[PDB]
């Protein structure tokens, strides 16, 4: 799918989402990026779907960079079961995304394909996005 090969622990606490992305606010790779505007948990099935959507669009062309990785496990109890009796079983994994995070990047693609591309990738995310270029995002030192 797109899970992590190994993990020290199988289930982990849900947590929370206090705004600000902390890190990942600049481009640093491609030429155009897709920046998250709302906080959320992005499931690997979305990351996947978005990726395929781009390659499908501009088939045989530039390179795509996936800046996030679903390492947080998602728990979910079975159906018709009551509360308690231990934590549920993992149904998949999700990556935590906060406002300002650059989720994707594209390179070696015309500005048209790029825009159109990312516009489609944002239609698969449970949140709102924004597309960017590159310019002040040069924190090299």
């Amino acid at each position: 799918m797109l899970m992590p090969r190994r993990m020290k622990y199988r289930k982990q606490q849900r947590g929370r989402l206090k705004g600000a992305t902390k890190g990942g606010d600049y481009v640093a790779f491609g030429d155009y990026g897709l920046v998250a505007l709302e906080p959320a948990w992005i499931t690997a099935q979305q990351i996947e779907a978005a990726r395929v959507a781009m390659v499908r669009h501009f088939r045989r062309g530039g390179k795509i960079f996936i800046r996030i990785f679903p390492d947080k496990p998602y728990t979910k109890k079975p159906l018709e079961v009551r509360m308690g009796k231990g934590k549920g079983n993992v149904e998949g994994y999700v990556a935590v995304v906060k406002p300002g995070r650059v989720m994707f990047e594209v390179a070696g693609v015309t500005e048209e394909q790029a825009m159109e591309a990312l516009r489609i990738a944002g239609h698969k995310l449970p949140i709102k996005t924004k597309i960017v270029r590159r310019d002040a995002y040069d924190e090299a030192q």
Partner: protein, 184 residues
Amino acid sequence: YRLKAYYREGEKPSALRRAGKLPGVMYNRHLNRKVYVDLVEFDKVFRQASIHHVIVLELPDGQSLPTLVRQVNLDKRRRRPEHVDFFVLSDEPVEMYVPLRFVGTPAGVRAGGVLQEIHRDILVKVSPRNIPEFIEVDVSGLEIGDSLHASDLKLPPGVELAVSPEETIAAVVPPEDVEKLAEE
């Protein structure tokens, strides 16, 4: 390039930045003042410029100073800059990442491939009067697989860098072929 600058007394950071003035500080191995340089021209300039071309800083003293920006802290949520560091100069040779153009067409753009210009702004040690520009590199010979890198380039007399030299400056990688799918 040029640009007006004013003296900051150190009063209401978050306020002087909304009113239009952009906070910042100019320093060196001697003095260091706190100032405010409006977003308007700063933006316009900073985008054309960057941290490569020198800038003037005409204060109420006329004192036009040559400087380069070292640190620009953004605002995360909703792009905007929150601070800027001005490095004063003189004749002292120091570092700075110099732009990189890669004139050419690799052989890795005929059967699938794209240039990943990794470090397209190399840091180099050199004095003021010695501040070039578009330090082009050749790309017309980069085959699909194997690809150039390190500091194996044309360093005009005076370009006494600070790399390794190994730091992969650019590479040619395959495309994104629709042919995929899997599982198991």
